[PDB]
Design a binder for these strands. Structure first.
Ligand code: DCP
Ligand code: MG
Ligand code: MN
Length: 580
DNA sequence: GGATCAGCGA
DNA sequence: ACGTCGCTGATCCG
């Protein structure tokens, strides 16, 4: 039923009040330099709809905006903030974000628009976004009066949902988690995205050059070794032209056939010199398309920068997400892939990249929550549990543990505390089930207080229906009561990982809050560029490095006081690769 | 277009 | 039965 609003053809005084619901509509999925299709304003004085072309020229409207004393209630404020940034317009004053509010109250709700968020509060006087602009090869902006009626309903929806959403947060002890943590971070992530990272494009290209070379040269050998013309990309083909054309053993099977995962071609290599050229050719493939081109595809022409979008209310545990491109999955494990980081450089001349980590954080975080005597005492002794477990998964001595090695021991360590079964472990470090099984018993012999944790957090979820993080981020687990054994089991493994994965994500979020607050009150040219789950990557002039090497680690270790010490590793250099 | 698959990261 | 949490490129298939 037509909600009455005045389609404004000019701005006015009564629509620039010190509190209003705002909507700077960015239909485009990727808001980087995306046009603004419309504006809407609800405030005690009424409901208005301003046309972008208009309002974004009006200095009185542009002022009310950039004015932090003029309050704005919104949904996905970063989406608008970044879009405006690219227009030279500053957006301050956002005191409430409906999107992040619904995320804290229940990340499983999967809110992708105001309607979905509103529905969560028995408010449905608003249409879902997909209904208004559609999707697929049809997607478009409805005509003036349709776009208008919707933007005003979304704004009106935001106007009314603030109270309901804030109260439940208040009762859930998440009001501060919203206002003092999630909302502050949204402005910082906007800067990081708008700032973007510089891309050594010339190099990156001269990389794709040779790749194609070492590709076909490893593609024909494949047709040779196989003796035909199958496409290395069809697992169905890799299955037949393998175990059924080329007769090899099946050590594992998929829900369609038999695994051709790398953890198989590996074990099934010596049975033919084709399984080796497939391992290498697939690596060069991935690294070729999913990166060289994949990155250059998002590199803007002028600034030569890429601008990731840090999705803040997407993951179910509190972690951030990155897309177009995913800068949280840049190669680093092997040497070939790692060099691509030499393509990531400082944004200004004579600057440096400063990357800071967090030493075995989830393990430290588990130590604090689980409170196992020996896991804490160990850290209080400053040991590297990854290297140690490596000393076993290889029986070697501390001095004989390699970077490559510490990785598997690391994956084993988390595999073990987060559910892993003797079979899962057995296939990982490629051993027997009886060995893996006993290695896990001794693990919990080393950390009994932790065993007790895997057992009570399962009961905790079973009783409350939700797990929680250090900073009060909660995760509902209704499948914990499932009568299906595997639904219940996945639920239980979530109750074991979410509190830990989530608390670690809360801490890197708070550290980020202290880091911007510090860099600002000390006024430095340095700023954050990326967040990689438990690592921050800043860029600054060479002259600030000496102050960074102390301020960046100190801020991160201070964020929260655990029963164990936090510890940061940090390095810097001319490129992302150099920063080590 | 979607459903698996592949491979990369934390 | 199944460690957790993500994103992107490639090809099978109506
Ligand atoms: N196989 C993995 C790898 C990582 N993580 C989680 C736990 C780690 O603590 C966190 C950060 O990833 P890192 O690679 O930084 O691992 P740590 O931080 O634990 O090790 P490092 O001492 O190298 O920082 O991500 C996990 O659950 N399972
Ligand atoms: Mg890391
Ligand atoms: Mn780390």
């Amino acid at each position: 039923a037509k909600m009455a609003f005045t389609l404004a053809d000019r701005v006015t005084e009564e629509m620039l009040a010190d509190k209003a619901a705002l909507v700077v509509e960015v239909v485009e999925e990727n808001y980087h330099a995306a046009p603004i299709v419309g504006i809407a304003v609800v405030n005690e004085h009424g409901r208005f709809f301003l046309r972008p072309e208009t309002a974004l020229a009006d200095p009185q409207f542009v002022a009310w905006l950039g004015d932090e004393t003029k309050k704005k209630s919104m949904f996905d404020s970063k989406r608008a903030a970044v879009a405006l940034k690219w227009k030279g317009i500053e957006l301050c004053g956002v005191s409430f974000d409906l999107l992040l509010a619904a995320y804290l109250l229940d990340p499983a709700q999967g809110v992708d628009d105001v309607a979905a968020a509103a529905k969560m509060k028995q408010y449905e006087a608003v249409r879902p976004d997909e209904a208004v602009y559609g999707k697929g090869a049809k997607r478009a902006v409805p005509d003036e009066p349709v776009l208008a009626e919707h933007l005003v309903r979304k704004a009106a929806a935001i106007w009314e949902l603030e109270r309901p959403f804030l109260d439940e947060l208040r009762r859930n002890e998440q009001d501060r988690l919203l206002v003092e943590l999630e909302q502050p971070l949204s402005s910082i992530l906007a800067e990081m995205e708008f700032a973007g990272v510089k891309v050594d494009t010339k190099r990156l290209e001269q990389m794709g050059k040779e790749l194609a070379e070492q590709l076909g040269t490893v593609e024909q050998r494949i047709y040779e070794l196989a003796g035909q013309e199958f496409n290395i990309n069809s697992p169905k083909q890799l299955g037949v032209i393998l175990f059924e054309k080329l007769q090899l053993p099946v050590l594992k099977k998929t829900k369609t056939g038999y695994s051709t995962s790398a953890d198989v071609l590996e074990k099934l290599a010596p049975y033919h010199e084709i399984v080796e050229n497939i391992l290498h050719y697939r690596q060069l493939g991935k690294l070729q398309s999913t990166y060289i081109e994949g990155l250059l595809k998002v590199v803007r022409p002028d600034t030569k920068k890429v601008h990731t979008i840090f999705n803040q209310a997407l993951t179910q545990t509190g972690r951030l997400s990155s897309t177009e491109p995913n800068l949280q999955n840049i190669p680093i494990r092997l040497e070939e892939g790692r060099k691509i980081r030499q393509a990531f450089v400082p944004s200004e001349s004579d600057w440096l990249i400063f990357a800071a980590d967090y030493s075995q954080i989830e393990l430290r975080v588990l130590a604090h929550i689980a409170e196992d005597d020996n896991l804490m005492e160990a850290f209080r002794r400053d040991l590297d549990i990854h290297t140690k477990t490596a000393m076993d998964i290889f029986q070697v001595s501390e001095d004989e543990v390699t970077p490559n090695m510490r990785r598997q021991a690391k994956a084993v360590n988390f595999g073990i505390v987060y559910g892993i079964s003797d079979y899962g472990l057995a296939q990982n470090l490629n051993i027997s089930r009886k060995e893996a099984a006993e290695f896990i018993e001794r693990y919990f012999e080393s950390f009994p207080g932790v065993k007790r944790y895997m057992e009570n957090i399962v009961q905790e979820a079973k009783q409350k229906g939700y797990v929680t993080t250090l900073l009060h981020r909660r995760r509902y687990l209704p499948d914990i009561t499932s009568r299906n054994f595997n639904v219940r089991s996945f639920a239980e493994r979530m109750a074991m990982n979410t509190p830990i994965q989530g608390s670690a994500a809360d801490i890197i979020k708070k550290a980020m809050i202290d880091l911007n607050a510090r860099l600002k009150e000390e006024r430095l040219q340095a700023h954050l560029l990326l967040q990689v789950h438990d690592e921050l990557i800043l860029e600054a002039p060479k002259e600030e490095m000496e102050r960074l090497c102390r301020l960046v680690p100190e801020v991160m270790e201070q964020a929260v006081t655990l029963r164990v010490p936090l510890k940061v590793d940090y390095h810097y250099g001319s490129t992302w690769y150099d920063a080590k």
